[PDB]
Amino acid sequence: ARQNLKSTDRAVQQMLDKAKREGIQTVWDRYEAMKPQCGFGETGLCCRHCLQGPCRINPFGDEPKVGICGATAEVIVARGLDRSIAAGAAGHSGHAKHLAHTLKKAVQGKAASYMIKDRTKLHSIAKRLGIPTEGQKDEDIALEVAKAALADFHEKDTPVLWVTTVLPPSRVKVLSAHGLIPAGIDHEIAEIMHRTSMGCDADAQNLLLGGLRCSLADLAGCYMGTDLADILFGTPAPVVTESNLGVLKADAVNVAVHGHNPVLSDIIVSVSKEMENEARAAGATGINVVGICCTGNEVLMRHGIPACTHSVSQEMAMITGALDAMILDYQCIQPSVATIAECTGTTVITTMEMSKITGATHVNFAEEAAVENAKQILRLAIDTFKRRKGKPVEIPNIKTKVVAGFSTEAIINALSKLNANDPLKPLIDNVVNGNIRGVCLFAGCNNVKVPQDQNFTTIARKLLKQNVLVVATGCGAGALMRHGFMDPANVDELCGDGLKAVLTAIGEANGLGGPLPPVLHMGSCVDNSRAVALVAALANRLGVDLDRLPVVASAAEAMHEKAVAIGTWAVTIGLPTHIGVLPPITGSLPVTQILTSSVKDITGGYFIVELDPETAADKLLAAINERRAGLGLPW
Amino acid sequence: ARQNLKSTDRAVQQMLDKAKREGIQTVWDRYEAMKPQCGFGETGLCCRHCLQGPCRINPFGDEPKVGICGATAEVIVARGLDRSIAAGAAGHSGHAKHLAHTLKKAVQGKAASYMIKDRTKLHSIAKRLGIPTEGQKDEDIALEVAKAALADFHEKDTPVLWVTTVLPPSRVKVLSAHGLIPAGIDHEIAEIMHRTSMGCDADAQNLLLGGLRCSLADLAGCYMGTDLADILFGTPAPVVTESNLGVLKADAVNVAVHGHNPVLSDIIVSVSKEMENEARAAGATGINVVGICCTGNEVLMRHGIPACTHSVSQEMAMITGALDAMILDYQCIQPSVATIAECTGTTVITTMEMSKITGATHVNFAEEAAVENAKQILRLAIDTFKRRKGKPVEIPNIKTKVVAGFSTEAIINALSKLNANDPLKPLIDNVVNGNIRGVCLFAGCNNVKVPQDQNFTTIARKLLKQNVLVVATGCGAGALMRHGFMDPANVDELCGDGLKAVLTAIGEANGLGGPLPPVLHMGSCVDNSRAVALVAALANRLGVDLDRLPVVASAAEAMHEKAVAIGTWAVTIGLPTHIGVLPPITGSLPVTQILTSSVKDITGGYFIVELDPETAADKLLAAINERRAGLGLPW
Numbered sequence A, B: 001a002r003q004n005l006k007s008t009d010r011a012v013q014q015m016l017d018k019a020k021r022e023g024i025q026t027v028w029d030r031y032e033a034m035k036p037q038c039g040f041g042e043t044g045l046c047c048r049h050c051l052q053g054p055c056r057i058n059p060f061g062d063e064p065k066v067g068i069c070g071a072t073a074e075v076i077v078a079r080g081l082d083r084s085i086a087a088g089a090a091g092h093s094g095h096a097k098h099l100a101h102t103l104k105k106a107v108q109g110k111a112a113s114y115m116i117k118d119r120t121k122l123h124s125i126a127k128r129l130g131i132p133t134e135g136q137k138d139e140d141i142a143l144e145v146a147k148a149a150l151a152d153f154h155e156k157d158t159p160v161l162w163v164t165t166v167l168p169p170s171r172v173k174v175l176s177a178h179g180l181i182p183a184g185i186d187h188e189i190a191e192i193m194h195r196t197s198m199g200c201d202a203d204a205q206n207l208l209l210g211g212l213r214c215s216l217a218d219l220a221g222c223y224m225g226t227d228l229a230d231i232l233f234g235t236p237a238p239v240v241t242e243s244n245l246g247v248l249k250a251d252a253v254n255v256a257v258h259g260h261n262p263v264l265s266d267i268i269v270s271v272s273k274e275m276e277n278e279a280r281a282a283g284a285t286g287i288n289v290v291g292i293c294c295t296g297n298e299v300l301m302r303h304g305i306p307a308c309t310h311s312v313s314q315e316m317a318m319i320t321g322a323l324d325a326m327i328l329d330y331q332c333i334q335p336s337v338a339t340i341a342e343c344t345g346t347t348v349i350t351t352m353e354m355s356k357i358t359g360a361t362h363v364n365f366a367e368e369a370a371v372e373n374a375k376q377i378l379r380l381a382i383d384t385f386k387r388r389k390g391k392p393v394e395i396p397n398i399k400t401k402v403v404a405g406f407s408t409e410a411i412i413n414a415l416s417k418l419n420a421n422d423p424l425k426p427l428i429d430n431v432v433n434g435n436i437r438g439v440c441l442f443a444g445c446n447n448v449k450v451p452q453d454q455n456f457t458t459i460a461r462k463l464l465k466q467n468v469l470v471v472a473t474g475c476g477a478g479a480l481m482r483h484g485f486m487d488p489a490n491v492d493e494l495c496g497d498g499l500k501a502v503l504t505a506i507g508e509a510n511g512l513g514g515p516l517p518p519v520l521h522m523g524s525c526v527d528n529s530r531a532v533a534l535v536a537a538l539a540n541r542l543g544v545d546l547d548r549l550p551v552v553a554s555a556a557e558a559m560h561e562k563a564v565a566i567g568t569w570a571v572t573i574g575l576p577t578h579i580g581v582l583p584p585i586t587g588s589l590p591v592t593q594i595l596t597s598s599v600k601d602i603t604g605g606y607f608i609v610e611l612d613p614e615t616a617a618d619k620l621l622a623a624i625n626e627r628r629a630g631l632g633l634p635w
């Protein structure tokens, strides 16, 4: 088996060979077993929204041509897409809401393991929301912020403030004119589920406008999540760490935090440090916390916790034989981990009531008892380490250096070393003079249909050589970090001369041995909201709307409904947005044309669907350069 | 073509012949074109919750056996079902919320077309909710009720009051012990969409418990909808009217109200009466408003507006050639109506922003301008009548007499004529002495897979002969009314001697020429909440929980996600609940076993899946009789 056809990560390839000889089924094996996949589903031409279904429509040929109730291909495709957007928005609803309740508990004295760690961020959020701070106690300010967060989930006398206060007024005006500003986060989710149910909305344009509005409810959840996590756990600043499977250590208790919410992982990290002696009593060197997926990104960004792996290759951490525990909250966890754990010895532990996996151990994690619950969880990990005494493990000796922690505040601060009172100006100067061609955000998942990381690295290499400033989040950041794109030592190899000059000038002004890394890691998937903050700040500084900026996004290997939601809000706020996997929309040309073309006339953004990464890079460059030309700039 | 294989309604058969010779495609033709339907979808063994899909699992045989992410058949089936429940709950969220906003506007002076029509109901709801009334203005009481309604959509310091205040404390306690009381209506909908997204909840029991909780959010929406509609439009009392296509009149402007919300249809009815002279100026006798689906049920129950048709046969009203307008809000409207309108001349008019149909005319309907918007809509209808001057129409001369309007208040009042201060006692006495074997609620849709009305009438006939008191809502009530089950003249033919004696004694005490009708029409689908009120009142009077009462439900020909949600809350509140179509759960035996068996140990209710109606009737009788035996009663 040619493992490089499955993943371009050599550590993953090594574990795939191990899984094969041990007879352990992987995500790639389950994919092979699924081929050929259903063409109706692949194109979006299937509906199960009532008990008269399933209905399907032949992409081409003869009957069936229409759903039983009369639903056309346009309607069916648009309804399916809208439900995916709502599902993504719901995941970010759950995440943000979790943090809002935690902040509220903390400042009410009900969860002493949590506290206001970033007072400056708290006050800045309060001011943005219009909440008074002068003469007010921090705990009361925080209580008001938490109440405002929770209020954005339902209808009230104002729209969703985590949309209207985070985008420039001109953008809010454009969106309002089209009826696209959400009334409430969970309100929009419910309205999508209603309008897409049988015998309701049956006009493609109307349905898709609803989807754009629900995508902004998702944006609000993301931005709220980042805001609240920064208050509770600290705003990221530049950090140095490592990534890939080689960060596991045979002589340590290896504990992966996996899922999404720092409410959980942040405490695991702090408590693990207090349990060092207890781990040593058990014959370990200590507890080695490592990250998977977004919650890994959260603790990487804030604490420099090394990232083990991401997304599609998550099972491979277990295959090493050295993963003593995998601590889960929710989202993007392959439920296969629960059965693979039987083979590998790993203790898989769920912690949230709405996210259990048959065969896992469930240990409820209450914010009110976070430290004690964390100790219980970590003691299971220690017991597991003891059980593998004398057992061979195979940790690929493969890892990269990673510089990360580029929050928007961190980026502005780094730039301020070149211009203290106008920090964005040096960036803009270099866009204008051509040293920086534009900005591309890589975001989102890996997808088993695409050799792992192949689209991210192929596109990033082409853009970097063309002097594009590249930023990344989520498992896109994960892909790029595992392939060396966050190691400043690789700037000479990867970057165009203009971009190199800029990364070097900024790094040198920040007292570094040299440049910023080739790609700036802006955090987890909710932290795509940080990229919004940066872009909106640039828009405001320039006095133009986001759809005039040379900024694009690429979900190069997208998988989750959350990726569909984020991609859709990227388009809604005005960005050309690449998706590198086939979305289930191709069964309807009219829907495809709306999403890739006519939406430009509504929001200024648009999707670029392109499965070939070299071609995608060309299309992204063309989009950046069109923006440059629109600003009167050379390109 | 043997049209009786499609529908057992002779008026529908006649219109099917007309559609055939005119080449107009119908729902039955679109169904035929869809055969054979996908077996993966039919069994629930398909997942499209991420862009790695579509995934499927062979019901039997070889691979694929598991989803790409590791999702088992149990997980996939349970996640799909949970999303259907959430979608149903969302439709009732939208409906109830619409009414809450309307009530609020009315009493704030912003929508003068609306008012408090049922003051007694307003005060009784206030008291149930714990809202003070003494010394308070009606408008302020109503404002508090509307605010309480809107508050139940989100988390707050109390659970959903439209669950906890409408079920007996012992039932609330059972549900609370299992964590099943909703925190907020839209909150639960969003949590379902989150937990069922990729890489989240992956334990069938955990998922299904979540579904039961979300079904109670649906119950709350239903009960809220009925409560608010009764306040605004009046609580139904016994009425006499007619049903089936023969209620259309060639010499009148025929206007169908179709969809769900009385906010719209109630005004159409009142305004149509004011426009009689304008219709006569146009050469009509007047405006003949007729009902389709639930909004038809709403105006039938309150005003005796005749019901034209229901559910699967809705297109047939248009095929007569005499339907001048079809006025739509949302839900259960086949979008085919928009294209069929081109052939038939009918003006199809949408009115709600989130429910448009390509090719229809959209006329926005604002509560703030209800009368003017209604006149605009009706003037389109009048213009349409004028266009068919001299054109032959074919209205089947087929209709039945219908006695309806049996709200729970109406039922209690009718019983009170036998016992003024203990109205429920005569009903209970007759259950105990065997004159009434038990109670069966028929609810829900028709479904093109089942010859229209065949399950409803077959099951009802068997139960009535066995002295079961039958009540009905929605298009189940529609089926039964179109086949004569709401005409008291048919009591001798249909009813067992015991039931006849009871219906006669109650009717005679209410001053009738004779009995109540064979089946009691309790209203629209949200008015399934009326049946809950009745059953809960019986439970409270007897001092036992609902799962000890000889009461069952049958969604004999279910279709919509709303039917799945209602069926699931029927089970959750403790009822044996029949479904007469194949739900997409058979691909997982463990899920099937939970829903049809082990859930008894949680809530006392359970599903009875049975496609053969004679067998379903036997199973329903067995369930009733088991309840009788549990109470120590003969059977």
Ligand code: SF4
Binding pocket: A047, A048, A049, A050, A051, A052, A053, A054, A055, A067, A068, A069, A070, A071, A197, A198, A199
């Ligand atoms: S909603 Fe329409 S297209 Fe979808 S399953 Fe039902 S009948 Fe088929």
Ligand code: SF4
Binding pocket: B047, B048, B049, B050, B051, B052, B053, B054, B055, B067, B068, B069, B070, B071, B197, B198, B199
């Ligand atoms: S969630 Fe799992 S089972 Fe569903 S489509 Fe994605 S990979 Fe397949």
Ligand code: FES
Binding pocket: A038, A039, A040, A041, A042, A046, A047, A054, A056, B038, B041, B046, B048, B054
């Ligand atoms: S027919 Fe395959 S996804 Fe429905």
Ligand code: FES
Binding pocket: A038, A041, A046, A048, A054, B038, B039, B040, B041, B042, B046, B047, B054, B056
């Ligand atoms: S394979 Fe047919 S419903 Fe998906």
Ligand SMILES: [Fe+3]
Binding pocket: A260, A293, A294, A332, A474, A525
């Ligand atoms: Fe993530």
Ligand SMILES: [Fe+3]
Binding pocket: B260, B293, B294, B332, B474, B525
């Ligand atoms: Fe209905």
